[PDB]
Amino acid sequence: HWGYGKHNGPEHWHKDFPIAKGERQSPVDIDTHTAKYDPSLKPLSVSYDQATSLRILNNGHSFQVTFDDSQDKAVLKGGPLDGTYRLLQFHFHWGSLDGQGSEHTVDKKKYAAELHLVHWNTKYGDVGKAVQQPDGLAVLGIFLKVGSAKPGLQKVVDVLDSIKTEGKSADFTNFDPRGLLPESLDYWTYPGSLTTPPLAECVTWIVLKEPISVSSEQVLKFRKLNFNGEGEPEELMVDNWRPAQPLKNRQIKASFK
Ligand SMILES: [N]S(=O)(=O)[C][C][C]C1234B567B189B21%10B32%11B543B645B786B917B%1021B3%114C6571[C][C][C]S([N])(=O)=O
Ligand SMILES: [Zn+2]
Numbered sequence: 001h002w003g004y005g006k007h008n009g010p011e012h013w014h015k016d017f018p019i020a021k022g023e024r025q026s027p028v029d030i031d032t033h034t035a036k037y038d039p040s041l042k043p044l045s046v047s048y049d050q051a052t053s054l055r056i057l058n059n060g061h062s063f064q065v066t067f068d069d070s071q072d073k074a075v076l077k078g079g080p081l082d083g084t085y086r087l088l089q090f091h092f093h094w095g096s097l098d099g100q101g102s103e104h105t106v107d108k109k110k111y112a113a114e115l116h117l118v119h120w121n122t123k124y125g126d127v128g129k130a131v132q133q134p135d136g137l138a139v140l141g142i143f144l145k146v147g148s149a150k151p152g153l154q155k156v157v158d159v160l161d162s163i164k165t166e167g168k169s170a171d172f173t174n175f176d177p178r179g180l181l182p183e184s185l186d187y188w189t190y191p192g193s194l195t196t197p198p199l200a201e202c203v204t205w206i207v208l209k210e211p212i213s214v215s216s217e218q219v220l221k222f223r224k225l226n227f228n229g230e231g232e233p234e235e236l237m238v239d240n241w242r243p244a245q246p247l248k249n250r251q252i253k254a255s256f257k
Helices: 151-157 216-222
Strands: 044-047 053-058 063-067 075-078 085-094 113-121 137-146 169-171 187-192 203-208 212-214
Touching: 075 113, 085 137, 085 216, 137 216, 151 216
Parallel strands: 137 203, 137 212
Antiparallel strands: 044 075, 053 063, 053 169, 063 085, 075 085, 085 113, 113 137, 187 203
16 A cells, blocks of 8 residues: 555555556656746636535545536636646645645745645546546646735634544535635646546646745644554655656746746
8 A cells, every 4th residue: 555655655666567667657856947938838827716516635645625526616727728627625735843844846846735636527427547648637737935924714624623644534625725826827737647646647737837835834734644553553745745756858837927
């Protein structure tokens, strides 16, 4: 069973998921001087006004907020994408201390955490079919730095005590993911993969340039979660990030100059 530890972490994943050593793996370091501005890229369209959150879940690798994706209610379009991508869930990756936790890096800089909003292409009908396609998923990645609190995150932080251990879930209705977005939608994009098993090469990554700020108290609550199930030896859910992978033959494009 895969995880983030010494004996089951990212360096081991290739044994069960040989695509881990593939040609389009994520995350990557974003070298800002090498990314080329592409004036043909569109502004990203984020349409979250009718989002319907359902549940919050500790899945043993992160916590996630899940949405109703049975209609086009919370969709990502434009940017580098062709067609319409439905929001399925968001989750986070974070560190044991504020100097690590992000998956993507920017000129080798690591952020305290990274938010991923996972969307799937409606042309494939369901997420399981979408993960088998090179353009099946679009993940919107947002960096978190520690400073001022993010008010729109607090509803999330306040229920984490109720999902401490793997398999726990709770009702989480009426959560508005617009409250997690930075001002600017300027972004980098590149073709990549899921950053957890099965590591499928199905993702168009859209990584926002502008981080959000969260407070030390907010991130400390992330770090009280447990990788373990209830009753098992307590292992803080921290450092649940895959390191940067080889860029290989890929170009990172910037939406901005
Ligand atoms: N039919 S199926 O089980 O392959 C569908 C998998 C859907 C997933 B998988 B689960 B669902 B979707 B895909 B990966 B893991 B959970 B979500 B992405 C998941 C976790 C985040 C991967 S990341 N960090 O690249 O956003
Ligand atoms: Zn993720």
